[PDB]
Amino acid sequence: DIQMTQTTSSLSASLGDRVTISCRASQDISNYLNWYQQKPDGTVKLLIYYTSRLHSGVSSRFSGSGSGTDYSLTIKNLEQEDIATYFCQQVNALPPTFGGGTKLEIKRADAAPTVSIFPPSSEQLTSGGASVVCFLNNFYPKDINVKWKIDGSERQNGVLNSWTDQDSKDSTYSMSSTLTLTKDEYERHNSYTCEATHKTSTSPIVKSFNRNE
Amino acid sequence: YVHNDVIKFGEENSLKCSQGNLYVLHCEVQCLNGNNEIIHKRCNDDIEKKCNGNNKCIYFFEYELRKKTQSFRNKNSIEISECVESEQNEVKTSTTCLLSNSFILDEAFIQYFFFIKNKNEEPVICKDGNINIKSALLHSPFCEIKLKDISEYIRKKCDNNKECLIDPLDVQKNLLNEEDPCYINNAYVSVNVVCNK
Amino acid sequence: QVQLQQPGAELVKPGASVRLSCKASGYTFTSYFMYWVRQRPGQGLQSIGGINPNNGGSNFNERFKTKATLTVDKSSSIAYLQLNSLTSEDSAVYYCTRRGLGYDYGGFAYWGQGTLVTVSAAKTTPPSVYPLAPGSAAQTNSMVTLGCLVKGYFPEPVTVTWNSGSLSSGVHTFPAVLQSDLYTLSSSVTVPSSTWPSETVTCNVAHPASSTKVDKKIVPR
């Protein structure tokens, strides 16, 4: 099995930019190299085959080049739609083999999170559980931290966090933070707070409610 | 022996038979057009005119719009119209050497072995006796499926008849429901056949 | 039009095997190899192997020489990938795929949706869905964020839409997280304050593994 190597794991470029993604085979593959785009939803599309032949319907912004072991995918005038993972593949010697892929992220202006907090629903409480939820939406860059407080006391146990991939339409990121405890413990306290610390300010963005209101 | 050649535009292909004469099996052009899409064009007839029935030939392919040189090399040129100059362009073609290009089989009780072109219309004919197919194989060495055994089809359609039409295009289009240009434009057949009585 | 149809999901007990199907249509099945590809959740594409439907002959990538068995049914134009004696590490999406053209340099232009194989002893369980409704708010033009919390289901995937797909912008559906053999996920939607609650907002949660859909209306509290 010919080993394929994509050197860059992850790429960040601005709109309109030109990006190059490289691929290297462990032995001469005589131009039998293909390129694929996998969008965040998992759908795989053929872009280029035989080094440089565009697949039908693919935009001429994509081009391929190379020979021997070394091959390059070029994307001109980057568009938002281009957020994806790009994979090469040799078909010179069966079985075919893929490179490890290169993730492409599109730059945008920094953005503070939009923070919203939700108490447990009546429905969930009726079943005996109590989840407090907090969304930190449409921020940029990726890195963010959230802290939960219950009656002023920081709380770590029972917190489950989840992060989206980069939004294909506005290039932002979003996060969900869910603090779960028993209905009994929930009813032993009054105020609940989630605090988002993001590089767009030293002061956390704070959202809170009181259970008895 | 089958020569399966892949050649660029500009590159000369020089064929020569140690014995026998050339028989062209298929030819295909793949090139960018002015609308920067990959198109397919024929070249079989051109190669046949230069090569078939000769012990040697030489040719190269070139573009409609070119700077015309004066050179003795030019007698070997074959122009392909709608193509525009591009490294993506490519011709794939195969030839083989045979002692005879006739499909009339003169003797009984001896195996004949020969190839049948991509778009053959000439029947195999026993001068004496009737046909009996030992093997009929569909070759497509440039495609991901390289070989199909069509012996049973040819056998039922020809055995115990005086003549047999083996038409790879009709076999593929009508028996195998083939639509892919790789197979349609480049497959060819080899046959092993005997005339009995 | 070329179509390769795969089931959304397979739940397989550890140590058992499963036969994945890939039902092809819109082209002549015997004119192409069928190939298969694996993708573990956060990883890349890995080729498994491919089969010639005319003679049943196949090639395999090294890592799958025993893990995978390829067959076809020419009559019904179905390709099968049998995965043998699975472990949790075989949990992954499995795609079938075929070349766009029959040339030996062809790339893989047609892909099935991929089957998410979950290797686990846990039992299928439908989701509970809870509404995430905002508290009191002034009469201002600040946009309103709503949501739904989905808990207690197994296996993945669940899909979420809003107003049966009508409300498509301003939605974030977050990756599921596994806890105690149960998944939890959530989705948010942000709408103009002029619309909800007079215009209704409902989240629609689909869980094909349990054949269940839950349509949770978000109501002011």
Residue numbers in the entry:
A (entry chain B): 11 to 223
B (entry chain A): 1 to 197
C (entry chain C): 20 to 240
Provide the authors' original text about this structure:
Recently, a fourth interacting partner of RH5 was identified as an abundant glycosylphosphatidylinositol (GPI)-anchored merozoite surface protein called P113. P113 has been localized to the merozoite surface, as well as to the parasitophorous vacuole, and was shown to tether the RH5:CyRPA:RIPR complex to the merozoite surface. The interaction is conserved across the Laverania subgenus, and the core of the interaction was mapped to the N-terminal region of P113 (residues 1 to 197) and a 19-residue peptide from the flexible and disordered N terminus of RH5 (residues 9 to 27) which does not interact with RIPR or CyRPA. As well as being localized to the merozoite surface, P113 is also associated with the membrane surrounding the parasitophorous vacuole, where it has a role in organizing the PTEX protein export machinery.
A complex of P113 residues 1 to 197 bound to the P3.2 Fab fragment formed crystals that diffracted to 1.95-Å resolution. The noninhibitory antibody, P3.2, bound to an epitope on the narrower side of P113. Both are formed from a four-stranded antiparallel β-sheet which packs against an α-helix. The GTY motif is lacking in both domains of P113, causing this region of the domain to adopt a different architecture, which does not form a binding pocket for rhamnose. Labeling these protected peptides on the crystal structure revealed the core of the 10C8 epitope on the surface of P113, which was located on the opposite side of the domain from the nonblocking P3.2 binding site. Together, these data localize the binding interface of RH5 on P113; one possible location is the groove formed at the interface of domains 1 and 2, which lies in close proximity to residues D106 and E107.
